[PDB]
Amino acid sequence: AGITGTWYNQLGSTFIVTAGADGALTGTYVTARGNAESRYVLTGRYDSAPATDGSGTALGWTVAWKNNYRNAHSATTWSGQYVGGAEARINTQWLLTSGTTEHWYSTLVGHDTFTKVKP
Amino acid sequence: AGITGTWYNQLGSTFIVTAGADGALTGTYVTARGNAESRYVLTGRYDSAPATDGSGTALGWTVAWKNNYRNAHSATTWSGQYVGGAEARINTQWLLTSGTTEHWYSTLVGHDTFTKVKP
């Protein structure tokens, strides 16, 4: 798959993921401060048989922003595509929803480009 | 076009739009408080020759949240589709960007369904 391992966004965050043979993604997302309190569980799914002709491999994952240190009462999902080669990347769009505020103004949208080397 | 006139979202906001023969949209968006300070300029575009076979008519508009009363240093764009008939609707998704905060966490996403009758 080429997905298993460590990936870096352009803001200093990291995640570390294992891609299972079945389509499972499991790992840890680490925000840019990089300490214990910056580590969060992630889980998701990916296409374990992508088109050989196509551009990439579809995938998505979720982080709920609670760990044993802190709780930001929110969750982010990243939806995107892994592209292999010499400059491998995971191109994503993300949705960050807050649990605390009313739903219709609760969700931020953005994008992240993950690489195998740091920015 | 069926677009010119007044439309209501499901939260109590209104807008009033004129659809020009050329594709122009011009009007006023009025937030749910409904007073002078709640009125904002809107401008946008629409498909002035939609497919006769298709589901609807593509359109979009922008409101910058400044009027002569107040300034929320932000802008919302709605992108969507007008559907005619007895229960006409404009189905939209929107992006609200703040100017003041750093761009990567600056944009909320949501949706609005506009009807010709109030909720």
Binding site: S13, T31, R33, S38, Y40, W65, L96 | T101, Y105
Partner: peptide
């Protein structure tokens, strides 16, 4: 959201 963990510096 500037203080949310996702965007922390």
């Amino acid at each position: 959201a500037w203080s949310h963990p996702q965007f922390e510096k």
